[PDB]
Amino acid sequence: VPFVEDWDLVQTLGGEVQLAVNRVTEEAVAVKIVNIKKEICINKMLNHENVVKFYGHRREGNIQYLFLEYCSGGELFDRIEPDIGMPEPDAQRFFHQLMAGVVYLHGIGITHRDIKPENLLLDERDNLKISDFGLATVFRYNNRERLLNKMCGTLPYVAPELLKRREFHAEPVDVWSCGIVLTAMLAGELPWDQPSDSCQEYSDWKEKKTYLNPWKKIDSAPLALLHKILVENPSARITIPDIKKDRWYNKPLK
Numbered sequence: 001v002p003f004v005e006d007w008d009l010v011q012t013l014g015g016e017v018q019l020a021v022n023r024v025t026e027e028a029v030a031v032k033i034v035n036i037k038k039e040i041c042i043n044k045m046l047n048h049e050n051v052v053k054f055y056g057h058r059r060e061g062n063i064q065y066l067f068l069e070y071c072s073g074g075e076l077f078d079r080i081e082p083d084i085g086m087p088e089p090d091a092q093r094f095f096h097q098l099m100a101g102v103v104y105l106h107g108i109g110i111t112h113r114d115i116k117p118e119n120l121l122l123d124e125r126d127n128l129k130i131s132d133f134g135l136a137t138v139f140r141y142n143n144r145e146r147l148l149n150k151m152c153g154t155l156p157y158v159a160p161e162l163l164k165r166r167e168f169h170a171e172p173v174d175v176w177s178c179g180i181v182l183t184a185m186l187a188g189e190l191p192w193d194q195p196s197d198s199c200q201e202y203s204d205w206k207e208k209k210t211y212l213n214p215w216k217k218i219d220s221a222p223l224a225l226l227h228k229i230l231v232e233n234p235s236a237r238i239t240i241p242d243i244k245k246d247r248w249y250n251k252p253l254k
């Protein structure tokens with residue numbers, strides 16, 4: 001069938017990410033036009049309903065193209081109302097979908113390392129999809145865990161061990177950033193610039209001053225979950241199997 005391989009670039013989404021529409025079928029795809037070898041290699045391993053789908057890649061000279069699932073709903077970031085957040089049932093549904101995606105990644109030994117609402121996209125049915133695997137890495141290979149040491153991520157979402165320890169386990173770092181994303185969804189604000197003792201807001205949290213912002217905006221049930229996720233010691237931090245047993249996580253909301 002002729003021309004079914006031709007795509008028209010119609011608008012810039014985010015190198016650069018463009019919305020491309022198929023000339024014949026009118027199918028919409030996101031095209032990333034450019035570290036890159038690893039991003040493609042990790043994308044080739046991924047297949048999950050809460051992970052932005054990878055269709056393929058092509059290299060036309062010095063320029064590299066990545067064919068990815070187009071998420072028409074845009075970023076979760078744009079669903080968060082500044083200093084308000086969003087309705088608790090929407091935040092719970094997005095958090096369930098985020099946990100499904102992260103469980104999947106950790107199960108195949110991949111850590112995202114940059115979970116934040118700008119990197120969590122929404123499809124036409126508002127289904128959450130983890131995007132941008134540019135900082136992702138393999139932390140488990142041949143059933144052997146590898147401790148990480150590289151400084152990767154975005155400071156307001158990074159776990160405190162990344163700033164304090166030479167080596168650290170990958171999975172609690174992604175759990176922590178999911179807790180900051182949950183905080184942002186329920187309060188429309190980030191709790192601190194970074195999780196350091198020098199940061200007053202971080203010290204206040206460790207001193208359990210939940211009568212302050214953003215915590216005072218969050219109901220006691222999701223706040224009890226945040227108390228288990230945003231634990232400084234990563235060995236004491238709640239694991240995803242235990243997040244799935246949490247009271248607020250399992251609370252029917254409408």
Ligand SMILES: COc1cc(C#Cc2[nH]nc3c2Cc2cc(OC)c(OC)cc2-3)ccc1O
Binds near residue numbers: 054
């Ligand atoms: C799965 O791995 C990746 C996925 C993407 C992607 C993508 C993508 N798919 N669909 C969109 C985007 C960005 C974006 C940004 C948007 O707004 C800023 C947007 O609004 C509708 C849609 C989209 C980029 C690098 C990756 O490594």
